[PDB]
């Protein structure tokens, strides 16, 4: 419902909320919208849950085969696999997917795949129903070559605004940092971003 990915200076941070609603009722108050595809190169998905889970499983299997047979996949390879899966089933699935990854050569890459199967790189990406309320703010407060803490603060502010102004979005704020050091998981509770 509120999904984001930003590449600052040393890697990529992907952030999301944790609210899953089956209508006006909250079906899952704390859901993990961040799914691992490989060790690196993994981000969050929006839209229908079943389609996104199936696409994520298929992409994970395909990239496992790619790693076993031809070396190590890049972020663009995962973006292409997602694009093919979304485009060939254009009339069958409604997912919407952002893919974020890290590698030594490029040091952080993001790809956006909306409904219809198109793919765009962009320096930062926002998606979901709540992101509609943060289009201006994210445009007014994004800079290239930021530090990790500044990126965490920017994601926290944007996701807090999205949670506040969207009914179907917002539990806790989950963040994943992918850099050369490794993969780091962060969680921010409502008492933090609401104040």
């Amino acid at each position: 419902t509120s999904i984001m990915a930003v590449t600052f200076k040393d890697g990529v941070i992907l952030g999301a909320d944790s609210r899953t609603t089956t209508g006006a009722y909250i079906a899952n108050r704390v859901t993990d919208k961040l799914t691992r595809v490989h060790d690196k190169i993994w981000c969050c998905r929006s839209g229908s849950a079943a389609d996104t889970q199936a696409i994520a499983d298929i992409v994970q299997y395909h990239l496992e085969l790619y790693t076993s047979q031809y070396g190590t996949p890049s972020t663009e390879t995962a973006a292409s696999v997602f694009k093919e899966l979304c485009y060939e089933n254009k009339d069958n699935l409604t997912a919407g997917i952002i893919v974020a990854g890290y590698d030594d050569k490029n040091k952080g890459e993001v790809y956006t795949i909306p409904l219809g199967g198109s793919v765009h790189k962009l320096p930062y990406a926002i998606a979901g129903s709540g992101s509609t309320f943060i289009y201006g703010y994210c445009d007014k407060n994004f800079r290239e070559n930021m530090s990790k803490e500044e990126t965490v603060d920017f994601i926290k502010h944007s996701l807090s605004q999205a949670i506040k102004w969207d009914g179907s979005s917002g539990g806790v704020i989950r963040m994943v940092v992918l850099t050369a050091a490794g993969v780091e998981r962060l969680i921010f509770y409502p008492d933090e971003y609401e104040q």
């Binding site: 499983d57 994970q60 299997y61 496992e64 085969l65 076993s68």
Partner: protein, 236 residues
């Protein structure tokens, strides 16, 4: 035609399977030993022709993250078996949600070899496969499969022409006392020393290829990482 297709001879034998077994022997010897929490495989990298690129001449394949395989026999059938094993492991992980155990993959490859030996339109593969891993429920594990569809697990194993000497030395060592070393480097050095005892030729860093299966993952050792054990063995 009992000697040309996989049909029974009057005495009840399959000659094509035996011929594939003969074809399993270039004459590279390989060894596999399991320790406390790791498994080590070593193979001979014989490249007498200087035109070949040494890094591309290998008989060890990383099937999955935790499983490694060493093949004895011609390399085309080895690559065929490696690709099949990789596909089966990936399919198992996708379908069942957890990593394929080493013995399960060995059983699947044995079933495929049996199917090859059962149909008259498919010849048996002339290779011998050894799968090594650290299974999450069984610890270190070594399983060998042959062109006859047979497969079984080993405390330690050796494949090649003069495998009898290595097997005799290993069984004598086990009668004396797995390996009680908690670090895989010690197990690698022990395997190298045992191979030197059985096949004495003073292996250099370019005459060996080593794969190590630990709990986290399976990997292989480069020539620079290979020459450190023999220096350590010599300095002891």
């Amino acid at each position: 035609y009992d000697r040309h297709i996989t049909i029974f001879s009057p005495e009840g034998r399959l000659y094509q399977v035996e011929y594939a077994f003969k074809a399993t022997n270039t004459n590279i010897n390989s060894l596999a030993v399991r320790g406390k929490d790791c498994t080590v495989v070593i193979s001979q990298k014989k490249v007498p022709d200087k035109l070949l690129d040494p890094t591309t001449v290998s008989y060890i394949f990383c099937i999955s993250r935790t499983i490694g395989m060493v093949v004895n026999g011609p390399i085309p059938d080895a690559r065929n078996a490696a690709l099949r094993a990789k596909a089966e492991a990936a399919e198992f992980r996708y379908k069942y949600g957890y990593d394929m155990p080493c013995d399960v993959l060995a059983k699947r490859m044995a079933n495929l070899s049996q199917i090859y030996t059962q149909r008259a339109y498919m010849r048996p593969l002339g290779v011998i496969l050894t799968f090594v891993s650290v299974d999450e429920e069984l610890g270190p594990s070594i399983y060998k499969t042959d062109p006859a569809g047979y497969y079984v697990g080993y405390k330690a194993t050796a494949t090649g022409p003069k495998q009898q000497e290595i097997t005799t030395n290993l069984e004598n060592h086990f009668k004396k006392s797995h390996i009680n070393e908690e670090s895989w480097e010690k197990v690698v050095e022990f395997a190298i020393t045992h191979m030197i005892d059985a096949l004495g030729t003073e292996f250099s860093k370019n005459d060996l290829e080593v794969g190590v299966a630990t709990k986290d993952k399976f990997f292989t050792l480069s020539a620079e990482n290979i020459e450190e054990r023999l220096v350590a063995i010599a300095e002891q």
